Design a protein around this ligand. Sequence first.
Ligand SMILES: CC(C)=CCC/C(C)=C/COP(=O)(O)OP(=O)(O)O
Ligand SMILES: CC(C)=CCC/C(C)=C/COP(=O)(O)OP(=O)(O)O
Ligand SMILES: [Mg+2]
Ligand SMILES: [Mg+2]
Ligand SMILES: [Mg+2]
Ligand SMILES: [Mg+2]
Ligand SMILES: [Mg+2]
Ligand SMILES: [Mg+2]
Ligand SMILES: [Mg+2]
Ligand SMILES: [Mg+2]
Lengths: 319, 334
Amino acid sequence: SKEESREFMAIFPDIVRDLTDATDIPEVTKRFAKVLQYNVPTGKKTRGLSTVIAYKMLEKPENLTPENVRLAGILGWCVELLQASLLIMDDLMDRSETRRLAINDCLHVESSLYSVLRKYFSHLPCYVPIIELFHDVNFKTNMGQSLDALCMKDGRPILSQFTMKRYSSIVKYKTSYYTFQLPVSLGMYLADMYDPEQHRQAKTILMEIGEFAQIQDDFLDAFGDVGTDIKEGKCSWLAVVALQRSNPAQRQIMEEHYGRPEPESTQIIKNLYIELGLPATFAVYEEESFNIIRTHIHQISKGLPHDLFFKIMKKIYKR
Amino acid sequence: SKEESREFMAIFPDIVRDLTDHTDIPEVTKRFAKVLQYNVPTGKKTRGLSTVIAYKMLEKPENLTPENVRLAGILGWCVELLQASLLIMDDLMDRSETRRGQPCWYRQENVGFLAINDCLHVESSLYSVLRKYFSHLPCYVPIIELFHDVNFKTNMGQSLDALCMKDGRPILSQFTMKRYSSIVKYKTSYYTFQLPVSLGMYLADMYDPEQHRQAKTILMEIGEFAQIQDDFLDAFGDSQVGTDIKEGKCSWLAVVALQRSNPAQRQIMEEHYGRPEPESTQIIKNLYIELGLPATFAVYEEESFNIIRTHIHQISKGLPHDLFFKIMKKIYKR
Ligand SMILES: CC(C)=CCC/C(C)=C/COP(=O)(O)OP(=O)(O)O
Ligand SMILES: CC(C)=CCC/C(C)=C/COP(=O)(O)OP(=O)(O)O
Ligand SMILES: [Mg+2]
Ligand SMILES: [Mg+2]
Ligand SMILES: [Mg+2]
Ligand SMILES: [Mg+2]
Ligand SMILES: [Mg+2]
Ligand SMILES: [Mg+2]
Ligand SMILES: [Mg+2]
Ligand SMILES: [Mg+2]
């Protein structure tokens, strides 16, 4: 929506002023403003806007005031502050050139979302549930990143670690919690929905959608119409399934050419992915997962709305 | 105190179990146990123990139960978790070889820049400890908010320190007493001195902002001497070794040197400060001797002690003077 996107983006200048003491240390406060301005507001803001959409579809229609929708927008920006911190750090860790300037900037940007929460939410019933959610998601996200790191040793991928169980765990902890669960749980808490069973049923569907989302992203990295997962030796769905299907000779090709800088080695891996019928395997998985997720959304109870979860599902599958 | 130290150290293994004992990912929880065991419990736990001591001197004697003193201990370990996360990061940022004898965590087999994740993880973990033990107590939200605020303030301090360096060379024009004082306050004094006392006050259900304000004033003054003394001893302490000069740090010695230096002496600092060659460290140390920095420190130690003691005598409301005198004595060693 034009109205939702514009109202959301209009909050950002306020967040910057809130976090930059708008003081005895103006030069470092001015620097932090530039850290936020470079790293937080550019690009799509899907997690932030999903927080507003979630609240709008969970809250009673009578309670949807401009004031409440703005609070949902502020929670959205706290998710985008978390996103920014993860993006700053991961790029240092993976020594990435581009995405789409100091080390402690990721700790600072992460820490800043709790100042925003304190400013706007400290007098509301949802305050402690929301801070505890952010605390738990950062802890779990770190466990995800560390599990991902345990698939690499001395710059070489550990292909024995490339199991579907470990992959599913990496996606859940590293990505799905903060990307899919966090926005919806935030929307629920702001709508004064605290029922554990409601959060649990939401979590189940969102982790399923999250897993397909990342598998699709992994697939498109190699087979989309420019991906470097193979070169970076990433624990990708393609690599995990390739090893499941591989005969000893196909396993040797992975062991020799996966996670190499030479463009020829990337091309060799893609050729093996084609030989192993990974495109067909993805098509089957996309159909099966869509039908299972559609079923689980139809089955959603505990007084949760289906349209929210269908909207999230549609955005990912694009049908 | 043997009993205090032993009681405090006995809590750590429970905290490791609280944070690592997520049954579907055993390898990462086992790794995190090791991250905590390497980085958190070894050497002096001065900040952690100071939290217990603060509480014991703030709380009503009748309320000092084994249970409450343990809660004070757990808050102290939350300070040590924050400490461990900061030192993990700072070592990567400064590319230091050792800290407290131990090789820096980032230098360990297959860590490097993954120390950023470990930094974030250890900092995050203290909030899990707070939830387990404090979620039901009135002090819960004030303590959570204090930890988040101190984290934010510490990051401002580290960034200000970083703005005294460019391309691995110190910016001597940035080495002013006003910027130095700000670095020490934000980077060190908040988490080292303010956080332990404020935690003790909150656990003793002391929420009066004016009490916290009066405490902060005194603790920032004691904190400033503590870092100046540490900076002095880096160059002039008996090793039986300080690398502040080699590292080109914004040290009290470097700041006061630049105040007292004639153009010729200013050129020695510009030429030799922050260089790796041992001869350059010798030249700076010799310039500090020439400029009479030892005498200058001796006068400051005497004058700051007297000024702070006066300020403690004038502390208002129901704050115990004895707590601030004990902190003073521990730092000045008199
Ligand atoms: C540091 C942490 C906790 C990250 C969690 C979320 C995240 C953005 C991971 C990086 O993805 P990736 O490195 O697998 O891929 P890419 O960098 O290509 O997005
Ligand atoms: C936000 C962060 C990461 C803050 C770091 C704070 C800190 C205690 C650093 C050490 O200071 P230093 O580097 O001047 O001294 P040393 O490393 O010698 O103790
Ligand atoms: Mg990564
Ligand atoms: Mg990456
Ligand atoms: Mg990438
Ligand atoms: Mg990808
Ligand atoms: Mg250092
Ligand atoms: Mg440093
Ligand atoms: Mg020192
Ligand atoms: Mg050092």
